[PDB]
């Protein structure tokens, strides 16, 4: 199980 969030601001 790969879970994944990125932000870029």
Known sequence: EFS???NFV
């Open 4 to 6: 994944n969030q990125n």
